[PDB]
Amino acid sequence: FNFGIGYGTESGVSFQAGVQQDNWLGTGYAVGINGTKNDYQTYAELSVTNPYFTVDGVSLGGRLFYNDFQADDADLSDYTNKSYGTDVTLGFPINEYNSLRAGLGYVHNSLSNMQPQVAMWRYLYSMGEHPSTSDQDNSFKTDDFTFNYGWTYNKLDRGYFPTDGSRVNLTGKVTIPGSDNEYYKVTLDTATYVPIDDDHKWVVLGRTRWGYGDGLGGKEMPFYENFYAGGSSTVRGFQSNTIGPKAVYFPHQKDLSKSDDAVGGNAMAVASLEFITPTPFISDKYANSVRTSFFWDMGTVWDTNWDSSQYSGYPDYSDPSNIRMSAGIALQWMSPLGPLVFSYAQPFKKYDGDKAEQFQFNIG
Amino acid sequence: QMQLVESGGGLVQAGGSLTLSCAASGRTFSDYDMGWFRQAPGKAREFVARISRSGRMTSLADSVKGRFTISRDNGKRTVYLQMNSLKPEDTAVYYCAADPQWSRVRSGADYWGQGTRVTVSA
């Protein structure tokens, strides 16, 4: 039994526990069980993996999982999503720096605790449902089958405190005929470290994250698959997940209610530039283990299906040009309690009731 | 004219469970939102649960939240009521109902079954 605990502004206290065994019983397969829990999510999985599906090193992996997501505890407009499902994945090493993945998946989603609101109800209508704008207690359940694909490039010089190279991760998903939902979703993440000096003590880091998904035919992508932005890992200085569209609630039993409750969206773009330098005023020998950075972060999340014509007087959440921006300082080092990172950032471009969070940290 | 026939009602002990079924005649079952209602002796009929044409959307009365579940099988032209953790207050005749409209089927319907009786003893 391997345990772990962490603490941060993004998810509060995180617990992790798991067991793993390669070459179980001399069969050649690895078997694992692991779980994680934080302020808004409980996740558990069982895994079986053959690292030599072919002699060449193609791996075949299987996953059985359960997940419990509480949207309001993740700083979104409220809902509960209890899910479970399976995945079978083929993994291809291309060379030492590149890997490819292709897999098939099943997922069951059970949605509840949804208050009537424009974007969610719009998705339900696209699914052929006719919920009333005063329905407080509906549940929605779906069974989806997917094709999943991925590509990872990693040529960073080292895992901890990188100074040179790039990492790129592309991940995509599309539903298979027979699913309830019909949609696709693609994500791209990049990070590139460019050292200035031969010593690699001064480094420029550029990061990007892109995301796009949409429904097929008349259907929309499910809102419980939306992208988010804001927080320690995307746009610092903003509360986790606050960036982008906000829920518009229907009157109880009048007019609509604007809120500041983030709902995410089906399109997202985030970029960051930061200047990694030696740490001033520090004692000698601490310097190599303590990394200071000055950053400029920026990001947007938007809703390509927002019908601006129907909601006159409300913000146009389909507009992709409301780019949030912040600047600030970060410090990172290894402590007795594990990896330590914190930042002070000031948002200087905000929109649509985004919530600020200047001081953000993570331990573990 | 579509007919609805409920079955599954019986005598059950408090804490036990039961599954009701409602079978529909004809080939138009998927055209209808479906509902379960119940009527205790001396009282008016009352809403219990409903389910959309597709089977994906459901809702439940407050008195059965967390205990009852509604589902349907459009291939078998059947809607089900799964009743767990039963109490003596659940004793009643249970009726199946069908209506073209989701919002209406919470209070009434175009088509009604003849009911199936459930008795929960303490």
PDB file of N, CA, C and O in Angstrom, chain A residues 14-53:
ATOM      1  N   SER A  14      -5.710  16.484  -0.905  1.00  0.00           N
ATOM      2  CA  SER A  14      -5.781  15.351  -1.818  1.00  0.00           C
ATOM      3  C   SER A  14      -5.182  14.119  -1.156  1.00  0.00           C
ATOM      4  O   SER A  14      -4.058  14.170  -0.646  1.00  0.00           O
ATOM      5  N   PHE A  15      -5.926  13.017  -1.170  1.00  0.00           N
ATOM      6  CA  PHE A  15      -5.440  11.722  -0.690  1.00  0.00           C
ATOM      7  C   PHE A  15      -5.295  10.774  -1.880  1.00  0.00           C
ATOM      8  O   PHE A  15      -6.159  10.745  -2.769  1.00  0.00           O
ATOM      9  N   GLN A  16      -4.225   9.980  -1.884  1.00  0.00           N
ATOM     10  CA  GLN A  16      -3.988   8.979  -2.922  1.00  0.00           C
ATOM     11  C   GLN A  16      -3.512   7.694  -2.260  1.00  0.00           C
ATOM     12  O   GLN A  16      -2.652   7.745  -1.377  1.00  0.00           O
ATOM     13  N   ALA A  17      -4.066   6.553  -2.680  1.00  0.00           N
ATOM     14  CA  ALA A  17      -3.652   5.241  -2.186  1.00  0.00           C
ATOM     15  C   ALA A  17      -3.742   4.225  -3.318  1.00  0.00           C
ATOM     16  O   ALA A  17      -4.684   4.267  -4.114  1.00  0.00           O
ATOM     17  N   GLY A  18      -2.780   3.306  -3.381  1.00  0.00           N
ATOM     18  CA  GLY A  18      -2.775   2.356  -4.481  1.00  0.00           C
ATOM     19  C   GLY A  18      -1.839   1.192  -4.249  1.00  0.00           C
ATOM     20  O   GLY A  18      -0.970   1.222  -3.374  1.00  0.00           O
ATOM     21  N   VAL A  19      -2.024   0.164  -5.079  1.00  0.00           N
ATOM     22  CA  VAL A  19      -1.187  -1.038  -5.097  1.00  0.00           C
ATOM     23  C   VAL A  19      -0.912  -1.409  -6.550  1.00  0.00           C
ATOM     24  O   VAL A  19      -1.829  -1.397  -7.380  1.00  0.00           O
ATOM     25  N   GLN A  20       0.341  -1.751  -6.853  1.00  0.00           N
ATOM     26  CA  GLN A  20       0.755  -2.079  -8.210  1.00  0.00           C
ATOM     27  C   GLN A  20       1.704  -3.272  -8.148  1.00  0.00           C
ATOM     28  O   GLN A  20       2.485  -3.412  -7.201  1.00  0.00           O
ATOM     29  N   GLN A  21       1.617  -4.142  -9.147  1.00  0.00           N
ATOM     30  CA  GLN A  21       2.492  -5.311  -9.208  1.00  0.00           C
ATOM     31  C   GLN A  21       2.765  -5.653 -10.666  1.00  0.00           C
ATOM     32  O   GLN A  21       1.860  -6.091 -11.382  1.00  0.00           O
ATOM     33  N   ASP A  22       4.008  -5.474 -11.092  1.00  0.00           N
ATOM     34  CA  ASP A  22       4.417  -5.942 -12.410  1.00  0.00           C
ATOM     35  C   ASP A  22       4.587  -7.464 -12.409  1.00  0.00           C
ATOM     36  O   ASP A  22       4.871  -8.084 -11.383  1.00  0.00           O
ATOM     37  N   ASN A  23       4.382  -8.069 -13.576  1.00  0.00           N
ATOM     38  CA  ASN A  23       4.628  -9.496 -13.794  1.00  0.00           C
ATOM     39  C   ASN A  23       3.897 -10.352 -12.758  1.00  0.00           C
ATOM     40  O   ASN A  23       4.434 -11.317 -12.204  1.00  0.00           O
ATOM     41  N   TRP A  24       2.634 -10.004 -12.526  1.00  0.00           N
ATOM     42  CA  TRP A  24       1.828 -10.669 -11.514  1.00  0.00           C
ATOM     43  C   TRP A  24       1.785 -12.174 -11.729  1.00  0.00           C
ATOM     44  O   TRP A  24       1.325 -12.663 -12.765  1.00  0.00           O
ATOM     45  N   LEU A  25       2.274 -12.910 -10.730  1.00  0.00           N
ATOM     46  CA  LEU A  25       2.287 -14.371 -10.742  1.00  0.00           C
ATOM     47  C   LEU A  25       3.107 -14.938 -11.893  1.00  0.00           C
ATOM     48  O   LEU A  25       2.885 -16.077 -12.309  1.00  0.00           O
ATOM     49  N   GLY A  26       4.063 -14.166 -12.411  1.00  0.00           N
ATOM     50  CA  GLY A  26       4.837 -14.624 -13.550  1.00  0.00           C
ATOM     51  C   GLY A  26       4.055 -14.714 -14.834  1.00  0.00           C
ATOM     52  O   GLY A  26       4.528 -15.341 -15.783  1.00  0.00           O
ATOM     53  N   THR A  27       2.866 -14.107 -14.889  1.00  0.00           N
ATOM     54  CA  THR A  27       2.051 -14.140 -16.094  1.00  0.00           C
ATOM     55  C   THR A  27       2.553 -13.198 -17.170  1.00  0.00           C
ATOM     56  O   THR A  27       2.175 -13.353 -18.333  1.00  0.00           O
ATOM     57  N   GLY A  28       3.343 -12.201 -16.800  1.00  0.00           N
ATOM     58  CA  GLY A  28       3.719 -11.156 -17.702  1.00  0.00           C
ATOM     59  C   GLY A  28       2.862  -9.909 -17.628  1.00  0.00           C
ATOM     60  O   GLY A  28       3.280  -8.859 -18.139  1.00  0.00           O
ATOM     61  N   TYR A  29       1.688  -9.978 -17.011  1.00  0.00           N
ATOM     62  CA  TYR A  29       0.816  -8.822 -16.889  1.00  0.00           C
ATOM     63  C   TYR A  29       1.084  -8.064 -15.595  1.00  0.00           C
ATOM     64  O   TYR A  29       1.382  -8.653 -14.556  1.00  0.00           O
ATOM     65  N   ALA A  30       0.923  -6.748 -15.662  1.00  0.00           N
ATOM     66  CA  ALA A  30       0.912  -5.899 -14.483  1.00  0.00           C
ATOM     67  C   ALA A  30      -0.528  -5.673 -14.031  1.00  0.00           C
ATOM     68  O   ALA A  30      -1.442  -5.534 -14.858  1.00  0.00           O
ATOM     69  N   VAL A  31      -0.734  -5.635 -12.716  1.00  0.00           N
ATOM     70  CA  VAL A  31      -2.061  -5.416 -12.143  1.00  0.00           C
ATOM     71  C   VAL A  31      -1.971  -4.316 -11.099  1.00  0.00           C
ATOM     72  O   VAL A  31      -1.027  -4.283 -10.306  1.00  0.00           O
ATOM     73  N   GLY A  32      -2.967  -3.436 -11.084  1.00  0.00           N
ATOM     74  CA  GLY A  32      -2.959  -2.296 -10.187  1.00  0.00           C
ATOM     75  C   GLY A  32      -4.346  -1.907  -9.730  1.00  0.00           C
ATOM     76  O   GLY A  32      -5.351  -2.189 -10.392  1.00  0.00           O
ATOM     77  N   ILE A  33      -4.377  -1.254  -8.574  1.00  0.00           N
ATOM     78  CA  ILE A  33      -5.583  -0.655  -8.017  1.00  0.00           C
ATOM     79  C   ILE A  33      -5.179   0.663  -7.363  1.00  0.00           C
ATOM     80  O   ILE A  33      -4.214   0.711  -6.595  1.00  0.00           O
ATOM     81  N   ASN A  34      -5.891   1.742  -7.681  1.00  0.00           N
ATOM     82  CA  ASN A  34      -5.541   3.023  -7.088  1.00  0.00           C
ATOM     83  C   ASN A  34      -6.784   3.882  -6.935  1.00  0.00           C
ATOM     84  O   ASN A  34      -7.775   3.709  -7.651  1.00  0.00           O
ATOM     85  N   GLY A  35      -6.729   4.786  -5.971  1.00  0.00           N
ATOM     86  CA  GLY A  35      -7.814   5.720  -5.746  1.00  0.00           C
ATOM     87  C   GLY A  35      -7.278   7.080  -5.367  1.00  0.00           C
ATOM     88  O   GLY A  35      -6.161   7.213  -4.864  1.00  0.00           O
ATOM     89  N   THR A  36      -8.095   8.099  -5.618  1.00  0.00           N
ATOM     90  CA  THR A  36      -7.745   9.465  -5.268  1.00  0.00           C
ATOM     91  C   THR A  36      -8.993  10.173  -4.766  1.00  0.00           C
ATOM     92  O   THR A  36     -10.117   9.861  -5.170  1.00  0.00           O
ATOM     93  N   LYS A  37      -8.788  11.124  -3.870  1.00  0.00           N
ATOM     94  CA  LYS A  37      -9.903  11.879  -3.310  1.00  0.00           C
ATOM     95  C   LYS A  37      -9.436  13.294  -3.016  1.00  0.00           C
ATOM     96  O   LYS A  37      -8.369  13.480  -2.424  1.00  0.00           O
ATOM     97  N   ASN A  38     -10.222  14.279  -3.433  1.00  0.00           N
ATOM     98  CA  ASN A  38      -9.951  15.669  -3.089  1.00  0.00           C
ATOM     99  C   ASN A  38     -11.296  16.328  -2.808  1.00  0.00           C
ATOM    100  O   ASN A  38     -12.324  15.656  -2.668  1.00  0.00           O
ATOM    101  N   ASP A  39     -11.312  17.662  -2.793  1.00  0.00           N
ATOM    102  CA  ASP A  39     -12.502  18.373  -2.335  1.00  0.00           C
ATOM    103  C   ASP A  39     -13.727  18.136  -3.211  1.00  0.00           C
ATOM    104  O   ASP A  39     -14.851  18.313  -2.730  1.00  0.00           O
ATOM    105  N   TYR A  40     -13.554  17.756  -4.482  1.00  0.00           N
ATOM    106  CA  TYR A  40     -14.691  17.674  -5.386  1.00  0.00           C
ATOM    107  C   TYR A  40     -14.789  16.378  -6.170  1.00  0.00           C
ATOM    108  O   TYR A  40     -15.752  16.210  -6.930  1.00  0.00           O
ATOM    109  N   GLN A  41     -13.843  15.461  -6.011  1.00  0.00           N
ATOM    110  CA  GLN A  41     -13.768  14.274  -6.845  1.00  0.00           C
ATOM    111  C   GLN A  41     -13.283  13.090  -6.022  1.00  0.00           C
ATOM    112  O   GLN A  41     -12.335  13.208  -5.235  1.00  0.00           O
ATOM    113  N   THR A  42     -13.938  11.951  -6.213  1.00  0.00           N
ATOM    114  CA  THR A  42     -13.465  10.668  -5.704  1.00  0.00           C
ATOM    115  C   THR A  42     -13.350   9.727  -6.893  1.00  0.00           C
ATOM    116  O   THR A  42     -14.315   9.573  -7.654  1.00  0.00           O
ATOM    117  N   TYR A  43     -12.172   9.122  -7.070  1.00  0.00           N
ATOM    118  CA  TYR A  43     -11.883   8.302  -8.242  1.00  0.00           C
ATOM    119  C   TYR A  43     -11.231   6.995  -7.812  1.00  0.00           C
ATOM    120  O   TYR A  43     -10.400   6.976  -6.898  1.00  0.00           O
ATOM    121  N   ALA A  44     -11.594   5.907  -8.487  1.00  0.00           N
ATOM    122  CA  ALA A  44     -11.000   4.603  -8.206  1.00  0.00           C
ATOM    123  C   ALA A  44     -10.911   3.811  -9.502  1.00  0.00           C
ATOM    124  O   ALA A  44     -11.785   3.928 -10.367  1.00  0.00           O
ATOM    125  N   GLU A  45      -9.867   2.992  -9.633  1.00  0.00           N
ATOM    126  CA  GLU A  45      -9.713   2.208 -10.850  1.00  0.00           C
ATOM    127  C   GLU A  45      -8.987   0.892 -10.562  1.00  0.00           C
ATOM    128  O   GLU A  45      -8.163   0.800  -9.649  1.00  0.00           O
ATOM    129  N   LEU A  46      -9.281  -0.109 -11.395  1.00  0.00           N
ATOM    130  CA  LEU A  46      -8.542  -1.369 -11.486  1.00  0.00           C
ATOM    131  C   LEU A  46      -7.930  -1.456 -12.875  1.00  0.00           C
ATOM    132  O   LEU A  46      -8.571  -1.080 -13.864  1.00  0.00           O
ATOM    133  N   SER A  47      -6.688  -1.931 -12.955  1.00  0.00           N
ATOM    134  CA  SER A  47      -5.967  -1.930 -14.222  1.00  0.00           C
ATOM    135  C   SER A  47      -5.216  -3.233 -14.425  1.00  0.00           C
ATOM    136  O   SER A  47      -4.635  -3.775 -13.479  1.00  0.00           O
ATOM    137  N   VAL A  48      -5.212  -3.702 -15.675  1.00  0.00           N
ATOM    138  CA  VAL A  48      -4.440  -4.862 -16.110  1.00  0.00           C
ATOM    139  C   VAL A  48      -3.734  -4.469 -17.400  1.00  0.00           C
ATOM    140  O   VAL A  48      -4.371  -3.938 -18.318  1.00  0.00           O
ATOM    141  N   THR A  49      -2.427  -4.730 -17.477  1.00  0.00           N
ATOM    142  CA  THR A  49      -1.632  -4.246 -18.599  1.00  0.00           C
ATOM    143  C   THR A  49      -0.635  -5.301 -19.051  1.00  0.00           C
ATOM    144  O   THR A  49       0.108  -5.858 -18.234  1.00  0.00           O
ATOM    145  N   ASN A  50      -0.614  -5.555 -20.363  1.00  0.00           N
ATOM    146  CA  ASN A  50       0.379  -6.425 -20.979  1.00  0.00           C
ATOM    147  C   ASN A  50       1.406  -5.542 -21.677  1.00  0.00           C
ATOM    148  O   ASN A  50       1.113  -4.987 -22.750  1.00  0.00           O
ATOM    149  N   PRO A  51       2.612  -5.367 -21.124  1.00  0.00           N
ATOM    150  CA  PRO A  51       3.593  -4.479 -21.774  1.00  0.00           C
ATOM    151  C   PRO A  51       4.169  -5.038 -23.060  1.00  0.00           C
ATOM    152  O   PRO A  51       4.900  -4.314 -23.746  1.00  0.00           O
ATOM    153  N   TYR A  52       3.874  -6.291 -23.411  1.00  0.00           N
ATOM    154  CA  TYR A  52       4.384  -6.894 -24.640  1.00  0.00           C
ATOM    155  C   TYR A  52       3.262  -7.605 -25.399  1.00  0.00           C
ATOM    156  O   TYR A  52       3.337  -8.798 -25.691  1.00  0.00           O
ATOM    157  N   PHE A  53       2.208  -6.860 -25.719  1.00  0.00           N
ATOM    158  CA  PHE A  53       1.174  -7.380 -26.608  1.00  0.00           C
ATOM    159  C   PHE A  53       1.788  -7.900 -27.902  1.00  0.00           C
ATOM    160  O   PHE A  53       1.384  -8.945 -28.415  1.00  0.00           O
TER     161      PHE A  53
END
